[PDB]
Ligand binder design. Structure first.
Ligand SMILES: CNc1ncnc2c1ncn2C
Ligand SMILES: [Cl-]
Ligand SMILES: [Cl-]
Ligand SMILES: [Cl-]
Length: 149
């Protein structure tokens, strides 16, 4: 068995959607990310109010690719005033640190049966950027990602 995730109460988990494969590669290389304004605001609030008591995990997926590509942990608050134009599109304002945990492709077929009660019971694989995942569903997703091969 594997009960690593039992009794974990502090932890928050979000979907990250990237239109760009390039941005994924740059995030893996330099351990940084940036979301939309409302996306950054959601993550910064969860990171700050967690106050080191647990992790904020990020489940990355390239829109249209049909698979999740990895897991990272958020490792800083959002700096909203940073160099512009470092990503594929000039849409994103700011930067925060991440630490990538898993880089592996996990087909949506492995995850589509987990549904998010906070998003109209939709499959977790039909989420938008910074969709938050309830902790109990997030544990199921993480166990799947870690044990896929
Ligand atoms: C640099 N961050 C990003 N890159 C590409 N796409 C994104 C991003 N955030 C949200 N979406 C949809
Ligand atoms: Cl999106
Ligand atoms: Cl939204
Ligand atoms: Cl929850």
């Amino acid at each position: 068995e594997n009960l690593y995730f039992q009794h974990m109460k502090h932890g928050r988990v979000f979907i990250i959607k990237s239109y760009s494969e390039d941005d994924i590669h740059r995030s893996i290389k330099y351990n940084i990310w940036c979301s939309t304004e409302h996306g950054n605001k959601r993550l910064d609030a969860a990171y700050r109010s967690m106050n080191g008591k647990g992790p904020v995990y990020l489940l990355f997926s390239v829109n249209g690719s049909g698979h999740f590509c990895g897991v990272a942990e958020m490792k800083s608050a959002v700096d909203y005033n940073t160099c512009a134009g470092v990503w594929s599109q000039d849409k994103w304002k700011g930067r925060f640190d991440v630490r990538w945990i898993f880089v592996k492709d996990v087909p949506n077929s492995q995850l589509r049966h987990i549904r998010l009660e906070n998003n109209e019971n939709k499959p977790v694989t039909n989420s938008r950027d910074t969709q938050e995942v309830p902790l109990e569903k997030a544990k199921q997703v993480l166990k799947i990602i870690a044990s896929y091969k």
